[PDB]
Symmetry: C2
Subunit: 362 residues, 2 copies
């Protein structure tokens, strides 16, 4: 009755450690990942302190090695000060992350010249990822061409954005992109229900026409990634709600529902949650690692999923068909039917594996 | 000085066993593969007997398990008689191969309706590969759309073909393709030297404009594959020369030369010889497997490479920069500096590995 899948990869998660551990930490976030059929995550650098230099990366790496229950890589974050300073640690990171729209004080870039400096100084063989909305997608693509390298665009959310990327790919430009589940399964039609606080997310929820354009242009989407952005309900409902949805525990159930409805194939799903993440970020295979799912079980997403400390979900009330039954990670049962069974610290930094280093010319 | 690469994959080799073992057998062909930095091969079904039914597949699987020095998967071949009969063994094969142009009596398909029957009966989740030249590419793409599934086009050789595939990808159609090294590094300009016998290959060598279109449209090429088609010199020079070049031992040196010249990146190469073959054919990772190459060593391709029984090469005289120094396959030294060190039978059928089965809905 079950289906065996390879170990799935989420290349865009915010696990909030160090500095935001009331929202989530490595142990709780990777528990959420395992319960969602995810066995490897790439953690974003907008923590407190942000991962914008070698000492912060060193700290975050040890916190993750001690807290993570699944395997991981850590992004470095581009700042207005660190271009040309990351060469020694660059290869130990998942990649470099550029935050090109409204963001946290330390990751804010004031000028496209600062983008150029990062594209010019970051090692040419290592991944660069950009949070780039609307015309920013076009702008960062221009910077990538001027510096003659590739770029990966995070959470594409709009018809405008996916059609621009489509046009770039038609010209042979080296761009890849990812889409998050809330931009495939939620729209403006849901804002009435969510409210202005819970509904706050960046990129914001799109129109029904945005959602339909993403599905119509599935061929253009290289990866699915949750953009797991845990904030507590108190923060989402308060005066200055931060953007973001939790999503690790709901991503695969939502997508398996789409597969069961014929909206995409099982292969389409596995290209976007396994093969393409591997090849874009040069992430290594995980030995004796697999996920068993039940495609027949129908359930309704509750007000909060078991594991994320976010303790809320924007998908509450949606009917889904598909559930993660068992996860085996490197030969150990990591998850069965609502219980995580590997301790904090079982997870490892895949960039330290010999097969996890990005190949490079001498 | 050396560079470590993952285990490379050649998804298009003719190893001639059973029935053509004077041209090559599993032991000699996989020795050639290892010497070329290849650790996994997909063997084509136009053997004698051809692999067009379960008994022939059973035989070929045992011959490969006994003779192969690297890991492998075996293609099934479409015939005018076997549509609807391969469902029980389909999942044990690399995929289904359709020979849509001039070919061997048993793989000859008389009618596009026979193509349709295979697309309709072959399991929808398993790979289909087509030898399709010129307008045949358009025709098989039409059949793929009518049956609403994907197709992979072998050895794209012409500007006409790569631009058609480019246009199909721009419309979001599920098509992938491979290009062989002789269509990137040889042209009509070389036929004077090769002669009409040695120069016989299908698809035939292209014009300089064909070669330049393939390089210009590298973004459209998903895989490199050798189309290793060993024939003895006596056969290539005789009255009725069969088409094909040997290529396993020269593919990587040629491509590494191109990398060293800046014609493509190391990543471009590894996408096309590792990641994309994996994800198109759902081939499993190989544990503790890697290839060490020396990018500085300049040498001239001789009149024949050491291992292929073909005992000739069309690349004789070309200057290359790049050489395979060491291959480790599943923890054992398989190749060092001109010597293969794993015996016939070390190789395994990757479709029998748990991680080597193609995921499918229940
Ligand atoms: Zn991202
Ligand atoms: Zn994010
Ligand atoms: Zn890689
Ligand atoms: Zn092929
Ligand atoms: Zn062939
Ligand atoms: Zn696969």
């Amino acid at each position: 009755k079950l289906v065996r899948l390879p170990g799935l990869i989420d290349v865009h998660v915010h696990l909030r450690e160090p500095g935001g551990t009331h929202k989530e930490d490595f142990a709780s976030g990777t528990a959420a990942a395992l319960a969602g059929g995810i066995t490897m995550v790439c953690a974003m650098p907008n923590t407190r302190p942000p991962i914008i230099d070698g000492p912060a990366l060193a700290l975050a790496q040890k916190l993750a090695e001690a807290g993570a229950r699944c395997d991981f890589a850590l992004f470095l974050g581009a700042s207005s000060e660190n271009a040309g300073t990351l060469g020694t640690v660059a290869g130990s990171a998942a990649g470099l992350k550029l935050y090109l729209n409204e963001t946290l004080s330390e990751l804010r870039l004031d000028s496209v010249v600062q983008w150029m400096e990062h594209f010019e100084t970051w090692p040419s063989h290592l991944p660069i990822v950009a949070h780039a909305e609307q015309q920013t997608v076009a702008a960062v693509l221009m910077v990538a061409q001027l510096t003659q390298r590739s770029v990966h665009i995070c959470h594409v959310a709009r018809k405008e954005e996916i059609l621009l990327i489509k046009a770039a790919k038609a010209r042979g430009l080296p761009v890849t992109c990812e889409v998050a589940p809330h931009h495939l399964f939620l729209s403006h039609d849901d804002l009435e229900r969510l409210g202005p606080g819970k509904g706050e997310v960046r990129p914001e929820l799109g129109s029904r026409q945005d959602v339909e354009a993403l599905w119509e242009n599935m061929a253009v989407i290289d990866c699915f990634a949750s953009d797991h952005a845990p904030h507590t309900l108190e923060e989402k409902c308060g005066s200055r709600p931060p953007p973001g949805f939790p999503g690790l525990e709901t991503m695969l159930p939502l997508l398996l529902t789409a597969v069961s409805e014929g909206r995409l194939s099982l292969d389409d799903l596995l290209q976007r949650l396994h093969h393409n993440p591997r090849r874009i970020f040069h992430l290594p295979p995980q030995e004796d690692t697999y996920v068993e799912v039940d495609l027949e079980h129908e359930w309704t997403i509750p007000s909060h999923m078991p594991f994320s400390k976010a303790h809320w979900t924007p998908f509450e009330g949606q009917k889904v068909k598909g559930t993660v039954r068992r996860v085996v990670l490197r030969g150990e049962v990591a998850y069965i039917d609502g219980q995580v069974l590997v301790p904090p610290g079982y997870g490892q930094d895949v960039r330290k594996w010999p097969q996890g280093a990005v190949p490079q010319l001498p």
